[PDB]
Design a protein around this ligand. Structure first.
Ligand SMILES: [Zn+2]
Ligand SMILES: [Zn+2]
Ligand SMILES: [Zn+2]
Length: 77
């Protein structure tokens, strides 16, 4: 990204698919949007899909939310 790494920040729409990583999330509310999940190490981990009721946002790039792989390949520095 232009300044280095990027925070995804995608705000989910109601019904949008989201993913947590049971291995890497610091807590079960840490999630990823579909693009970040598919473009991340967590696609090969023990993930758990949850449908959003809307609002809340992707935690990709939050360097304190993930025990491994805090950035997908799109958002990494
Ligand atoms: Zn994202
Ligand atoms: Zn990302
Ligand atoms: Zn993971």
């Amino acid at each position: 990204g232009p300044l280095g790494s990027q925070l995804c920040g995608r705000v989910f729409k109601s019904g949008e698919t989201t993913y947590s990583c049971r291995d890497c999330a610091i807590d079960p509310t840490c999630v990823l949007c579909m693009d970040c999940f598919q473009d991340s190490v967590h696609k090969n981990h023990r993930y758990k899909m949850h449908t959003s009721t809307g609002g809340g946002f992707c935690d990709c790039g939050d360097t304190e939310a993930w025990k491994t792989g805090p950035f997908c390949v799109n958002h990494e520095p």
